């Protein structure tokens, strides 16, 4: 079986937010429900990562490191995909029972975080990203940052990452374009991958502030609280090497 077909079969099942639409909306209420949904997505993302060919061959500490750095890029990228697929409009499709429509983005302080996520779906739509390109790109987001002193299994990681870079190349060629159009596409898709670092830095700035300010009463489930508690000191100590395809 092809490598991208193995990435396809491990795609997580649909998760519902459990949002009661018969109760009026509020930013605090939506942010709370989405944090709960986010924790459930990250639990499913662990099960997803363990099934990615090569991932379980890395040292256990490296597996933890990669899921802890990439959490937000995985969630924003998968969200961008659902939004791009479910609507050719400015909607954020977090869950089938919780879509951030035009009315919900008028809610106080909603747009601030939403604009970063809208950029992801806007870019996938502008570039007309395929299902196969998307799967290769999502795996590459899991492998997009390492500690400043590298991983325990750095050599094996470099081999795995290069393998999925080639898989993105193979997915691109399938679009039946010429050699010049394929080089432009590879450039464009790897440029979008690079820009996810900036998207995530903006999402994390807001998210870290919200997590630390206990007076806001914004709840995070155990899975997200544990990732954030791990990540805040790592960013504070400059302990992160963001991998880029372009300078």
């Amino acid at each position: 079986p092809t490598l991208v077909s193995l990435l396809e079969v491990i795609e997580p099942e649909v998760l519902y937010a459990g949002y009661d639409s018969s109760v009026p909306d509020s930013t605090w209420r939506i942010m709370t429900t989405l944090n709960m949904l986010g924790g459930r997505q990250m639990i499913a993302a662990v099960k997803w990562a363990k099934a990615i060919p090569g991932f379980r061959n890395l040292h256990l500490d490296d597996q933890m490191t990669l899921l802890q750095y990439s959490w937000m890029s995985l969630m924003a990228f998968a969200l961008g995909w659902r939004s791009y697929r479910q609507s050719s409009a400015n909607l954020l499709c977090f869950a089938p029972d919780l879509i951030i429509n035009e009315q919900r983005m008028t809610l106080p302080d909603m747009y601030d975080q939403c604009k970063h996520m809208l950029y992801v779906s806007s870019e996938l739509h502008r570039l007309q990203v395929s299902y196969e390109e998307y799967l290769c790109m999502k795996t590459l987001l899991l492998l997009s940052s390492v500690p400043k002193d590298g991983l325990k299994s750095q050599a094996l990681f470099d081999e795995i990452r290069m393998t999925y870079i080639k898989e993105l190349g193979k997915a691109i060629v399938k679009r039946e374009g010429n050699s010049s159009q394929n080089s432009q596409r590879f450039y464009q898709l790897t440029k979008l991958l690079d820009s996810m670092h900036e998207v995530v830095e903006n999402l994390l700035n807001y998210c870290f502030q919200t997590f630390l300010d206990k007076t806001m009463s914004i709840e995070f489930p155990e899975m997200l609280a544990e990732i954030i508690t791990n990540q805040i000191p790592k960013y504070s100590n400059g302990n992160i090497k963001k991998l880029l395809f372009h300078q």
């Binding site: 662990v46 099934a51 256990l60 899921l67 802890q68 544990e226």
Partner: peptide, 13 residues
Amino acid sequence: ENALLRYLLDKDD
């Protein structure tokens, strides 16, 4: 330290 994540990675799926 990261109890829940280590558990999910170490448990059998």
